[PDB]
Design a protein around this ligand. Structure first.
Ligand SMILES: CCCCCCCCCCCCCCCCCC(=O)OC[C@H](COP(=O)([O-])OCC(O)COP(=O)([O-])OC[C@@H](COC(=O)CCCCCCCCCCCCCCCCC)OC(=O)CCCCCCCCCCCCCCCCC)OC(=O)CCCCCCCCCCCCCCCCC
Ligand SMILES: CCCCCCCCCCCCCCCCCC(=O)OC[C@H](COP(=O)([O-])OCC(O)COP(=O)([O-])OC[C@@H](COC(=O)CCCCCCCCCCCCCCCCC)OC(=O)CCCCCCCCCCCCCCCCC)OC(=O)CCCCCCCCCCCCCCCCC
Ligand SMILES: CCCCCCCCCCCCCCCCCC(=O)OC[C@H](COP(=O)([O-])OCC(O)COP(=O)([O-])OC[C@@H](COC(=O)CCCCCCCCCCCCCCCCC)OC(=O)CCCCCCCCCCCCCCCCC)OC(=O)CCCCCCCCCCCCCCCCC
Ligand SMILES: CCCCCCCCCCCCCCCCCC(=O)OC[C@H](COP(=O)([O-])OCC(O)COP(=O)([O-])OC[C@@H](COC(=O)CCCCCCCCCCCCCCCCC)OC(=O)CCCCCCCCCCCCCCCCC)OC(=O)CCCCCCCCCCCCCCCCC
Ligand SMILES: CCCCCCCCCCCCCCCCCC(=O)OC[C@H](COP(=O)([O-])OCC(O)COP(=O)([O-])OC[C@@H](COC(=O)CCCCCCCCCCCCCCCCC)OC(=O)CCCCCCCCCCCCCCCCC)OC(=O)CCCCCCCCCCCCCCCCC
Ligand SMILES: CCCCCCCCCCCCCCCCCC(=O)OC[C@H](COP(=O)([O-])OCC[N+](C)(C)C)OC(=O)CCCCCCCCCCCCCCCCC
Ligand SMILES: CCCCCCCCCCCCCCCCCC(=O)OC[C@H](COP(=O)(O)OCCN)OC(=O)CCCCCCCCCCCCCCCCC
Ligand code: SF4
Ligand code: F3S
Ligand code: FES
Ligand SMILES: [Ca+2]
Lengths: 59, 44, 103, 74, 43, 285, 93, 70, 196, 62
């Protein structure tokens, strides 16, 4: 059975002011939360790093 | 807040649709327990 | 998929389903899960709280339910302040003791 | 978009027990007792300490095999 | 309808969020090792 | 006899995606034997064509150059001119011709709308693109599978239910002109689905979330004074994300060719659901 | 009051012998999607909560440490070690 | 201290003692820069105000102290 | 027997108290759909739902001491115990239907992930045999279930409206060629006409 | 063969996304963090960004 397909609406709709206005707020909140979580993860990651070793050192 | 994160993941990710409301609630309970533990432990 | 791999996969998923079902529905395991679920519900949905819906006329609400927040705050603040005072007293006592013992 | 942020408590968790308000004083008593015990132990350990450094503070080292630790000058 | 100690609940939730964010991000306790090359010296 | 094909399918999918991005908006000229001089006098329509019944067919734009001085100025008129004069295999739904049935809803040049009452850019330079409704499965050409839309419409019980017998049975359910005008601008929906195919929440969750149109119909049956199942309908639409998924984008009221305002109806429904949730606690005590 | 007549009837009168066989494969597929979204998504948050304190507060997890003193052994070219137990504590604030 | 990289030990008579000194002097500058950065971070943090600083200086800046000792 | 007195008092209190609520909880469970029948209790208000689920087992299993019971009290306790057992069976039935619903929804989710626009890596033109067999057997079981609920028009209608929805969506997801006539043979009889 | 139909320059998912998303994602980050980060960094340096040299940096081995 050949599965049916469709043309995604957002690929063929003229850009509108409503999309912009609403997705702007959604992206603002997404950016805020992502920035907070990424800052936490960045602090964790950098603090996880090892200490600098000597030159040509084994173990 | 937690509710909103779950709602966004459900509405945008097709795979996340697999989870029941019961599994979501279990994640909610575990997250609340972990948050309480974090708050308590940081001060110890 | 290949029908041989199909046989293997069907057998494996059947084994997984059977293992999960047995572990969940076994007598002692079933009882353990059944009790722990209710314990978790009690803990999560009936944890101690300071804010709650008041559905009773002022004549039908106890005094405890009007001053519980204040009692809790008094207890916690008193505990913190008393621990601070005990820390200071212990600092002074230790300093004096080790001073009088030498130098 | 819809506004959803708020600090108000959710009605799902706002119920009381049959006999009155939730068990707040009873749990706070336990919390205060536990905090008292924990902080008392911490204070007692912390404040009554001194560092005594003399020959009697040193003992002979040994391996996990129990033998005396000695390393050659290889 | 009335909610006992609603304001206390709001402030407790706000405090919990603030404390959790403070410890998770350590926003206030930054690192200044990156600024050391860009700092003057005394003594 | 068959074997595992995860690798072949994966490679084919990636390669096809890349190629389609390179060759997006594939176009085939209906009549290549046209002198570029002639095309100065004719406007270009890019019509989406796809016949899943034929195993050898794939989606594609087809370019038709037509003289716009031969038929009236509407999308449906141009589509039917192309069908009758150029290629009568084109497929599209059409009943009313005056924007009432709502069958001809299509993506008329970037905007979902009824093709029968929508004009097209008269300029001969900019091409016009006619495609089916976006997020609906395509059956053939400009014909989509609106079955799910109707199935959702059925779930709201769109029939007057009354819990109180009529006093005399020789009269009509009384309703003052105010309780009737309360429905004005709300019962004119023709179920074209043009709005709901433009709602992003309906793009993401077609099944769990009812469309703006169906929810507007539920609101119409709720605000109606003659029906007595107000609270029951409110509760029914309050399940999971049948209504909560709406994010008040407002595109629904912008696209509606009939001029209706489904966004306002959904806002009122949300307010009523919130009040219902609160007073299920406040009242019963 | 809501007219729950039909739901009340459904609750009162339900079959007590009707059951449906469950395709084990699909049940397992859904459950393992759930496990995928637990271990690989909520696992990140859980491990962060569990470990980040152990990264920013390490001294409270290792209470006792050891210190050594050494002496030479010339006649055998050896080194003699004396160990000592200490309470692992901050140093050089 | 800006110690020179050229060891002053005699390699002919004290080989290991010369090698140890050479390696120490070679890595001393880099490790000194790291130590200075850590100490600057510690003292600047201690100069903070209330929660941003002093109120929680000694107890919560533990990884920095551990790095400094290492 | 002080411990016996306390055990019996606890059992009586919990069981009788919950028995007055079983009607409401069961009605609410019926009201929602089969995707998450306990959705209202998890999200909106736990109207003694978890209490019923927990104490049904105790009512079934824990013993009784009639000498600690009155006459009318013992009759009331037996009635409440029977009500709790009825709730146990009702919950089991709802769980079975809900899991079957999730089976069908799993099939539909696989199809949807197949036809998703973001699916640039696993796009398949032709449905494979395994999912076709799964669809056929799932629809067979669904038809058998509908038949088995001929004595309960409300239950039959709810099962249709809830579970058959995803069967209809699966029907819409694919073209009418290949093995389609055979796969949806049972569905084409009545259900297909309902979902139009 | 996957055929994609897309208006790159006018569809809501296209150049309009490039114009919209970057200026909306960074709204709260900039307007909050930058003042907040500046306050957090400067409040330490009431007197200056001085490194009190605990080690003899000016002393070089002869
Ligand atoms: C498409 C390809 C793209 C490729 C990209 C490749 C990128 C490679 C990056 C490499 C690593 C860079 C690390 C920089 C560290 C900076 C901090 C620092 O120096 O710390 C010193 C660091 C110690 O860190 P720490 O002090 O403990 O804590 C650091 C923290 O950041 C805390 O420090 P802080 O407290 O000072 O923090 C400052 C504060 C500052 O915050 C603020 O105040 C924010 C201010 C923002 C202002 C922005 C203004 C922009 C203006 C916009 C205008 C628009 C107008 C539009 C108009 C339209 C029309 C109207 O917070 C932040 O900086 C926020 C950071 C959190 C980020 C949150 C988001 C995370 C997720 C998203 C990531 C990006 C995805 C992009 C996807 C793109 C897709 C197309 O130690 C060092 O000396 C290390 C130096 C850095 C090198 C590390 C090397 C590690 C190597 C690992 C191996 C693997 C490498 C792989 C490389 C691959 C390359 C391809
Ligand atoms: C350094 C520290 C360690 C870092 C790594 C830590 C990893 C921890 C464990 C992570 C476990 C993840 C898996 C469990 C979660 C649930 C997954 C799931 O739904 O399973 C089924 C689902 C598959 O469903 P399906 O049915 O096969 O797909 C068809 C459905 O319609 C699809 O429907 P759908 O909506 O469900 O599918 C969306 C799907 C996404 O899946 C997809 O459908 C597509 C995935 C590939 C997209 C690739 C980009 C496409 C083009 C976009 C434009 C890019 C432009 C770049 C250049 C710009 C130049 C200016 O979303 C997810 O995968 C959800 C979770 C995603 C975030 C967590 C994973 C992060 C991995 C980061 C590392 C990846 C490896 C290194 C890559 C770089 C090497 C140089 O996911 C998978 O099985 C794949 C999992 C992801 C694999 C990696 C793909 C790349 C992702 C990159 C994200 C980067 C984010 C930025 C921050 C990164 C910071 C590190
Ligand atoms: C403290 C140290 C020792 C701890 C030991 C813990 C042992 C737990 C074992 C659990 C075993 C399974 C239990 C199954 C259930 C059996 C009982 C039952 O069905 O309930 C009967 C009874 C009545 O139930 P019901 O009739 O169904 O009522 C609910 C209905 O909705 C009807 O509602 P209603 O409106 O009719 O009102 C009825 C009311 C009636 O309730 C009452 O009457 C109970 C009121 C409280 C106790 C009153 C008595 C106080 C004096 C006791 C003296 C005992 C002396 C013992 C001496 C022993 C000597 C050998 O019910 C309630 O209000 C329920 C209260 C639930 C409280 C839950 C507390 C959660 C938070 C706990 C941790 C808090 C940490 C805070 C830290 C924060 C730091 C900043 O409820 C209880 O027994 C409540 C038990 C609650 C706690 C259980 C779980 C504790 C877990 C703690 C966390 C540990 C995590 C460790 C890591 C994990 C791996 C180890
Ligand atoms: C196997 C079993 C199953 C396992 C499943 C897997 C997961 C594990 C489950 C285990 C079960 C327990 C889980 C933890 C509880 C989860 C609760 C939850 O999710 O609730 C969500 C739920 C969320 O509701 P919501 O609607 O979002 O509203 C939340 C808002 O925050 C609204 O909040 P609110 O407004 O209602 O406030 C709450 C209330 C809660 O607080 C309390 O009332 C409790 C107090 C503490 C009691 C601690 C008792 C601890 C007893 C321990 C005994 C030893 C145990 C040993 C056991 C050993 C093993 C047997 O807060 C307060 O009372 C605020 C006090 C503030 C004091 C301020 C001080 C002021 C001083 C100055 C005075 C004035 C001076 C003036 C000077 C003027 C100068 C000019 O929370 C609540 O509604 C309840 C409140 C939150 C309770 C949190 C409790 C956390 C406990 C964690 C314990 C971890 C123990 C680990 C042990 C490990 C051993 C190895
Ligand atoms: C490392 C830290 C560890 C601690 C912290 C843990 C934190 C995390 C949470 C953990 C949660 C999961 C726990 C593990 C699962 C346990 C499952 C289980 O019990 O399996 C039984 C279950 C069999 O029972 P069944 O099938 O439910 O019942 C039918 C049977 O034929 C039997 O029929 P039957 O009638 O012959 O016998 C019925 C009854 C034996 O019947 C009796 O003899 C009577 C028992 C007491 C009845 C309640 C009287 C309450 C009177 C008022 C007390 C007031 C106190 C002061 C407060 C006043 C103000 C509120 O036996 C049971 O079923 C015992 C179940 C456990 C206790 C249930 C009672 C709860 C309420 C009372 C305790 C809590 C305080 C509530 C206070 C407030 C009340 C309003 O399955 C098994 O046999 C599995 C065995 C293998 C698994 C491990 C078994 C462990 C056994 C532990 C026994 C503990 C006894 C209590 C010790 C209390 C010390 C102070
Ligand atoms: C360390 C690893 C880091 C890697 C970084 C990778 C970054 C990935 C960023 C992804 C952004 C989001 C899109 C992918 C994920 C979508 C998930 C989702 O829910 O979507 C589902 C939906 C699709 O599904 P749907 O529309 O079918 O919705 C589901 C509907 N049902 C349930 C009915 C099936 O959305 C999409 O996937 C939209 C895809 C849009 C793709 C846009 C591509 C733009 C490319 C721009 C290139 C610019 C180049 C410039 C070069 C300049 C040179 C000079
Ligand atoms: C938005 C949604 C997604 C969000 C995701 C969020 C994720 C949160 C994660 C939380 C946990 C964080 C854990 C951080 C661990 C970091 C380890 C690391 O790589 O550190 C860098 C390390 C070198 O560091 P170090 O030794 O300290 O040296 C510098 C000292 N000054 O580097 C090394 O030592 C290098 C060797 C180790 C790293 C190997 C990595 C292998 C990756 C294999 C990828 C395979 C898949 C490829 C796919 C594409 C194929 C075409
Ligand atoms: S809601 Fe608007 S667009 Fe949709 S059918 Fe009704 S009138 Fe037409
Ligand atoms: S366009 Fe879309 S999501 Fe809500 S209000 Fe209007 S429907
Ligand atoms: S052609 Fe009649 S309404 Fe569209
Ligand atoms: Ca009405």
């Amino acid at each position: 059975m050949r599965t049916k397909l469709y043309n995604a609406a957002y690929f063929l709709l003229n850009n509108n002011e409503s999309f912009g206005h609403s997705f702007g707020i959604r992206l603002k909140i997404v950016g805020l939360n992502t920035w907070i979580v990424g800052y936490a993860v960045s602090r964790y990651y950098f603090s996880s790093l090892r200490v600098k070793a000597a030159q040509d050192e084994r173990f | 807040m937690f509710k909103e994160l779950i709602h966004i993941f459900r509405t945008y990710y097709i795979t996340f649709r697999y989870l029941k409301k019961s599994n979501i609630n279990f994640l909610k309970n575990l997250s609340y327990t972990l948050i309480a533990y974090y708050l308590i432990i940081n001060f110890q | 998929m290949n029908h041989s791999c199909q046989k293997v996969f069907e057998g494996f998923v059947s084994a997984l389903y059977d293992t999960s079902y047995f572990f969940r529905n076994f007598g002692p395991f079933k009882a353990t899960i059944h009790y722990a679920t209710y314990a978790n519900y009690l803990a999560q949905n009936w944890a101690p709280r300071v804010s709650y819906i008041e559905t009773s006329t002022p004549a039908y609400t106890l005094a405890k339910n009007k001053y519980a927040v204040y009692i809790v705050y008094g207890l916690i603040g008193g505990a913190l302040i008393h621990n601070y005072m005990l820390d200071n007293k212990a600092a002074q006592k230790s300093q004096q003791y080790y001073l009088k013992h030498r130098d | 978009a819809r506004l959803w942020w708020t600090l108000d408590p959710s009605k799902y968790y706002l119920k009381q027990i049959s006999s009155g308000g939730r068990n707040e004083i009873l749990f706070t008593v336990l919390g205060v007792t536990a905090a008292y015990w924990y902080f008392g132990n911490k204070r007692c350990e912390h404040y009554w300490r001194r560092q005594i450094d003399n020959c009697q503070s040193w003992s002979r080292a040994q391996n996990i095999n129990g033998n005396n630790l000695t390393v050659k000058q290889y | 309808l009335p909610i006992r100690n609603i304001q206390f609940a709001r402030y407790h939730y706000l405090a919990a969020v603030t404390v959790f964010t403070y410890f998770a991000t350590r926003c206030c306790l930054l690192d200044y090792k990156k600024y050391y090359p860009l700092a003057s010296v005394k003594k | 006899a068959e074997s595992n094909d995860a690798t072949s399918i994966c490679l084919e999918s990636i390669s096809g995606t890349i190629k389609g991005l390179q060759k997006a908006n594939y176009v085939v000229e209906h009549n290549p034997n046209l002198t570029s001089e002639e095309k100065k006098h004719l406007k270009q329509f890019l019509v989406y064509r796809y016949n899943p019944a034929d195993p050898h067919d794939q989606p594609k734009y087809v370019s038709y150059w037509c003289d716009i001085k031969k038929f009236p100025p509407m999308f449906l008129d141009a589509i039917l001119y192309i069908k009758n004069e150029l290629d009568p295999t084109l497929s599209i739904r059409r009943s009313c011709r005056e924007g009432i049935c709502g069958s001809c809803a299509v993506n008329c040049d970037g905007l979902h709308t009824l093709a029968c009452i929508s004009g097209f850019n008269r300029d001969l330079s900019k091409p016009t693109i006619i495609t089916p409704l976006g997020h609906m499965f395509i059956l053939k050409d400009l014909v989509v599978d609106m079955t799910n839309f109707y199935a959702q419409y059925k779930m709201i019980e769109p029939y007057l239910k009354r819990k109180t017998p009529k006093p005399d049975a020789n009269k009509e359910y009384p309703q003052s002109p105010e309780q009737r005008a309360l429905l004005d601008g709300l019962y004119e929906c023709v179920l074209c689905a043009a709005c709901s195919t433009s709602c992003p929440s309906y793009w993401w969750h077609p099944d769990r979330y009812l469309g703006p149109a169906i929810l507007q119909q539920a609101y119409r049956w709720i605000v109606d004074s003659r029906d007595e199942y107000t609270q029951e309908r409110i509760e029914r639409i309050a399940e999971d994300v049948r209504l909560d998924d709406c994010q008040q984008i407002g595109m629904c009221s912008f696209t509606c060719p009939k001029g209706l305002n489904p966004q306002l109806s959904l806002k009122n429904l949300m307010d009523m659901v919130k009040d219902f949730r609160q007073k299920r606690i406040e009242q019963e005590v | 009051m809501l007219d729950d007549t039909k739901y009340i009837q459904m609750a009162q009168k339900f079959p007590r012998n009707v059951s449906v066989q469950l395709n084990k494969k699909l049940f397992v597929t859904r459950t393992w999607f759930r496990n995928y979204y637990f271990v690989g998504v909520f696992g990140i948050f859980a491990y962060f909560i569990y470990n980040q304190p152990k990264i920013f507060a390490p001294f409270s997890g290792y209470p006792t440490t050891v210190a050594y003193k050494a002496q030479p052994d010339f006649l055998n070219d050896q080194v003699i070690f004396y160990s000592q137990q200490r309470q692992n504590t901050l140093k050089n604030f | 201290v800006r110690l020179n990289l050229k060891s002053n030990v005699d390699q002919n008579e004290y080989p290991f003692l010369a090698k140890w000194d050479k390696d120490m002097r070679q890595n001393y500058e880099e490790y000194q820069n790291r130590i200075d950065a850590t100490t600057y971070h510690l003292q600047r943090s201690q100069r903070g105000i209330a929660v941003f600083g002093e109120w929680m200086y000694p107890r919560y800046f533990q990884k920095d102290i551990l790095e400094l000792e290492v | 027997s002080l411990v016996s007195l306390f055990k019996n008092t606890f059992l009586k209190s919990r069981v009788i108290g919950l028995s007055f609520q079983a009607q409401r909880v069961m009605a609410q469970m019926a009201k929602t759909d089969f995707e998450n029948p306990d959705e209202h209790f998890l999200l909106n208000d736990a109207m003694k739902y978890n209490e019923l689920v927990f104490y049904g087992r105790l009512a079934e299993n824990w013993s009784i001491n009639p000498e600690l019971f009155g006459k009318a009290e013992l009759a009331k306790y037996n009635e409440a115990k029977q009500t709790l057992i009825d709730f146990n069976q009702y919950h089991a039935l709802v769980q079975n239907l809900h899991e079957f619903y999730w089976e069908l929804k799993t099939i539909y989710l696989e199809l949807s992930r197949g036809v998703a626009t973001s699916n640039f890596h696993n796009k398949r033109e032709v449905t494979h045999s395994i999912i076709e067999s799964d669809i056929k057997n799932s629809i067979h079981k669904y038809i058998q279930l509908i038949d088995d609920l001929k004595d309960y028009p409300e239950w039959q209608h709810k099962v249709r409206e809830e579970i058959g929805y995803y069967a209809h969506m699966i029907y819409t997801s694919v073209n009418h060629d290949g093995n389609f006539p055979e796969i949806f043979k049972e569905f084409n009889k009545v259900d297909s006409l309902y979902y139009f | 063969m996957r055929r994609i139909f897309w208006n790159f320059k006018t569809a809501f998912v296209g150049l309009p996304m490039f114009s919209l998303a970057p200026k909306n994602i960074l709204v709260y980050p900039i307007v909050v963090g930058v003042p907040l980060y500046t306050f957090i960094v400067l409040q330490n340096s009431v007197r200056g960004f001085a490194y009190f040299d605990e080690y003899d940096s000016d002393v070089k081995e002869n």
